[PDB]
Design a protein around this nucleic acid. Sequence first.
DNA 1: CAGTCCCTGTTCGGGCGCCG
DNA 2: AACGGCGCCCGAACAGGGACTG
Lengths: 555, 412
Amino acid sequence: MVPISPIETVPVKLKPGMDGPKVKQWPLTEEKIKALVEICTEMEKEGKISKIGPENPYNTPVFACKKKDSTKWRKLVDFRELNKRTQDFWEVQLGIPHPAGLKKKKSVTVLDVGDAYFSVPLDEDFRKYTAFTIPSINNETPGIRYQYNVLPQGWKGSPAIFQSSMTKILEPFKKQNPDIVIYQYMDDLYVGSDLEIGQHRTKIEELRQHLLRWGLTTPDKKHQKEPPFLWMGYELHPDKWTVQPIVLPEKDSWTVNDIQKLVGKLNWASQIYPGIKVRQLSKLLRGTKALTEVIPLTEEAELELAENREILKEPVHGVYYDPSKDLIAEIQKQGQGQWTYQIYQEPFKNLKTGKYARMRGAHTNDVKQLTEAVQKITTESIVIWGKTPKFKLPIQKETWETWWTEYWQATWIPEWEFVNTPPLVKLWYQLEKEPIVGAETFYVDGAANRETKLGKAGYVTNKGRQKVVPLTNTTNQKTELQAIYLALQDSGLEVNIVTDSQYALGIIQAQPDKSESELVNQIIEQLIKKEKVYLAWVPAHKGIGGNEQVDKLVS
Amino acid sequence: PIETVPVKLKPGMDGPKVKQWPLTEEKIKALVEICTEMEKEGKISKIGPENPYNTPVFAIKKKDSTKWRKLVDFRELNKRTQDFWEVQLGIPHPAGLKKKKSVTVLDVGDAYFSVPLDEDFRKYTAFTIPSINNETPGIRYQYNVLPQGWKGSPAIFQSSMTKILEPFKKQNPDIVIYQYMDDLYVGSDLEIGQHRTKIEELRQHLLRWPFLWMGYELHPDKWTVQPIVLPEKDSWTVNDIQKLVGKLNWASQIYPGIKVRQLSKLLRGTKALTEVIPLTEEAELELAENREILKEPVHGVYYDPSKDLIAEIQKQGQGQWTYQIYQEPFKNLKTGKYARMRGAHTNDVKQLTEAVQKITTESIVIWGKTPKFKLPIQKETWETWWTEYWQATWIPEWEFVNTPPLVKLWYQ
DNA sequence: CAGTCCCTGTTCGGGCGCCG
DNA sequence: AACGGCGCCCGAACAGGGACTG
Ligand SMILES: Cc1cn([C@H]2C=C[C@@H](COP(=O)(O)OP(=O)(O)OP(=O)(O)O)O2)c(=O)[nH]c1=O
Ligand SMILES: [Mg+2]
Ligand SMILES: [Mg+2]
């Protein structure tokens, strides 16, 4: 006979055709034995755990670990076999709150529900599916077996049930106090208002007693009444915020797992520290698949690491969101496909910063990457503030106009303005729209054997110029690119090039300025040196113009 | 007082599990206000995390409208109940709707809120309202009545809709009425004055039983086609003839009688692209013969009701967009071109959004289906902006391609 | 006409950061 | 040695289209 808590239960089923968990216990140390027998007894008197007998043919092992910066221990149930047989839940936690999205509030209070999962009841018809034995001695007493009447920590349904139950309890309080902001994340509650400090504690006590009606305790141990508030791993001050101090490890020898933690902390630090790069550090995490393997720091990865430590020296901070002012986002090019940006409302008062260094596609240009960076900033800004910021981009209006009007794919940038801060983003070469009068016309072609990997590449021109080059260990696509490379090498500043290669034409028409292919980078280098280049396409194997002639040479 | 028509998913398929995407502030404030009223009216009810299903939701504003409309992306749920709205209780498509001089589209989806939904099926209509900056967790609901945007709603309501439209169809035997999703297509050959008057009679016919006051007008009789045309120049260069032969060679995949023998003979040698080539007597004959074949209709091109529709769109630049609708490759059922749409010369995504809506509307009028689009855009670009410009109560299927224009085929 | 190749694209799961 | 959430950078597995060979 256990009392039913005021919190409405959540009906939980299992996947059809499957039963409950039947896993043997794990032999642990005697330190954990004298730290859980007292918990199962305290929870038994408080109604959070009931005892069962032989009528429950299930079992599940459990372990315990010390709480972070606390004397109290934490009990975790290894429900990995129960999670495989429990119904799927839709998580109502859609993201992580960010302090840059918080508005200015005169009074702030941070709460923390004590015994979160242990204060929300489990489904009535589901408590029988949580059986676990507790041996008082490691090999003597058989130990009486208990069950769970609340949410066990470790079950894959515990977070979603708590987050949903917490919302239903706060709904009547938020309706009675519309002007009060309550950021609800897991058990920690961020409460803020523009009321006076005296009247603010009044509503806080009203909320503490409102939650007490459902068995939710807000102890004074984790009650925060004055700044700086520690919330979501940040330091919340009345007019600014900053991330909690980030410590980077400094080992003499660097392994793989050390860099993974290093790059991870830099990604977490890049949200407020401007100018963080991880290109050359992550470049060391390629190929090798041994987490315990020493990797020497390259000269580029060491200079990148030294420049990041000097950024973390000076203290930085962010501000809060004011809905009366506009949102501004400004991007800079860091080179090598790296981009950094800052979001602010007043100049030099950054709400947050960030970086976009993703390299998508084998061939791309700076305009494409800048477009992708704008899109990442837009989606990020809608999550945090629900609106798109006005952009300040290091690209001329004319440069962007030329790109998107002549591109074959739909592309667009929201309302933005040009900011003259080098390095500016530009198009390094422009393909002509019509054939060049007076320019030598090069008919290029390439062919390779699928078996021997041997091939040829060359050209013929209207003036009689001709070249054929044998190639070893190549492909048809490489010979077509090499043919275009030969025509650019052996032509004047203006040249017309005719090819049958849809592959080569598709790469060059997109005006790439960087490529993972050395051959393409050489083609780009030639295209930049030219003054006028016209690329035309004809279907192969049709007796068309000089393409029929150069086809005989390379095959 | 109505028995819930039983609805079952297609065998072997589970309910939709699609993540909600971020929403702007104005759209969340609109959905919170709309869902609160619907909850007070019992149309929806709050649910918990024991419902593993979820469907995205956002809001739109129709053309020349300032009122927010809730829109659910039931695309996943629709193709998981396809045996219902196509086999058991289907809606016949009138072949004369596309022949009418004027066709008005009426939003009648609000009528679906009067019929209850099968209790065993309500768990699949689950959706989640997000919060700004993740202040509060997701606010999940589920539908207690027939939801708007679900292909099963017009099917179940069809028996009710026929009784409402019966006195009006008897009163006017010439007016064609088609129902697709939340919309009602009313086509008539009457003049614009007589048409809109008869439309208002139908509105009053529905009132005696929040977007019923709107009426988007169409003119399917004025719908044009964009055939393949060849350039006509006084002088031709090597580059011109090379582009022409390349265009005709690709066109041979459609019209098998197109020849390029006499035109390719003009390019014998290794000539400069800008060299002018006078057309021979045979080349003029062959080019004239090919211009007539492009006017002739393609052989064996008809609509198969069992095959999905596919729509490809090409960005031609300067506000020009071309498209083709087909079921089998090179068997186009319709080719067209759009120009000077909203966002021309300033916004590609808005134009592309408008083009998708126009094409879908035409496909509903002509065949009663929505085509699956092949969009010339990057997935991340489209998924960032398309909801900002969507003005329709349905959503078609789409995929993303990248086909560089090797030869300008549909617009010289 | 099939069956491959070459190439480039996306999807996904795991590594790390961080929150509870 | 647990659960859920979001982010990044990584590689293996997979899909799809030109192009060549039997
Ligand atoms: C940190 C952590 C947390 N949780 C779940 C359980 C309760 C809530 C909050 O945990 P907590 O605040 O640290 O401990 P809690 O149970 O609330 O007890 P108190 O220390 O607050 O009194 O999240 C979890 O399942 N695993 C974890 O590692
Ligand atoms: Mg707590
Ligand atoms: Mg070739």
